Amino acid sequence: SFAGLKDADVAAALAACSAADSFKHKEFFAKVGLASKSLDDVKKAFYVIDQDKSGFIEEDELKLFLQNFSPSARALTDAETKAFLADGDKDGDGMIGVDEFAAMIKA
Ligand SMILES: [Ca+2]
Ligand SMILES: [Mg+2]
Ligand SMILES: [Mg+2]
């Protein structure tokens, strides 16, 4: 929905990673349309994925990343989770803050 994504691009990005261990976060961001948005929409997305409003994406939220796009989406595997987290958490504190998330999507 949010961050001005198109419903057809969300639907086709979930179809591309529907199989376990097929998710690659850089490919998903590009398919879903977010890699090209403005930073203001990038931030909107971050604050949706930060479900408890802590101002970070914790690893448990990151595991449920696709269920922000569709309630019945699968959880990420541990492998998928770990990859995404090591690329998103550049300051090493074990969770994603808003500047580091933006830097990851636009890198
Ligand atoms: Ca959070
Ligand atoms: Mg929480
Ligand atoms: Mg961090």
37 in Cβ contact with 96 (< 8 Å): no
In this structure, what are the phi and psi dihedrals at residue 56, rounded to the nearest 5 degrees? -130, 155
SS3 17: coil
- Annotated binding residues, written as ranges, equal 50, 52, 54, 56, 58, 61, 89, 91, 93, 95, 100
The C-alpha atoms of residue 75 and residue 55 are separated, in whole angstroms, by 21
The C-alpha atoms of residue 79 and residue 20 are separated, in whole angstroms, by 10
What experiment produced this structure?
A: X-ray
- In 1-107, at which residue ranges do the beta strands (DSSP E only) sit? 56-57, 96-97
The C-alpha atoms of residue 89 and residue 57 are separated, in whole angstroms, by 9
Measured in Å, residue 61 CA sits from the centre of ligand 3 at 14
Where along the chain do its domains lie? 1-107
- Annotated binding residues for Ca(2+), written as ranges, equal 50, 52, 54, 56, 58, 61, 89, 91, 93, 95, 100
For residue 59, give the nearest of 36, 37, 81 by alpha carbon.
81
Q: Which ligand is nearest to the CA of 47?
A: 1
To the question of domain 1-107 being in CATH 3.90.76.10, the answer is no
The C-alpha atoms of residue 99 and residue 85 are separated, in whole angstroms, by 14
For residue 62, give the nearest of 43, 35, 86, 32 by alpha carbon.
86
Q: Which ligand is nearest to the CA of 96?
A: 3
The C-alpha atoms of residue 82 and residue 88 are separated, in whole angstroms, by 10
SS3 97: strand
Beta carbons within 8 Å of 19's beta carbon, 6+ residues apart: none
Residue 13: C-alpha distances to residues 7, 33, 93, 102 (Å)? 10, 9, 29, 20
The C-alpha atoms of residue 72 and residue 54 are separated, in whole angstroms, by 24
Q: CB count, 10 Å around CB of 17?
A: 20
User: Where on the phi/psi map is residue 75: left (φ > 0), alpha (ψ -120 to 50), or beta?
Assistant: beta
End-to-end CA distance of the chain: 23
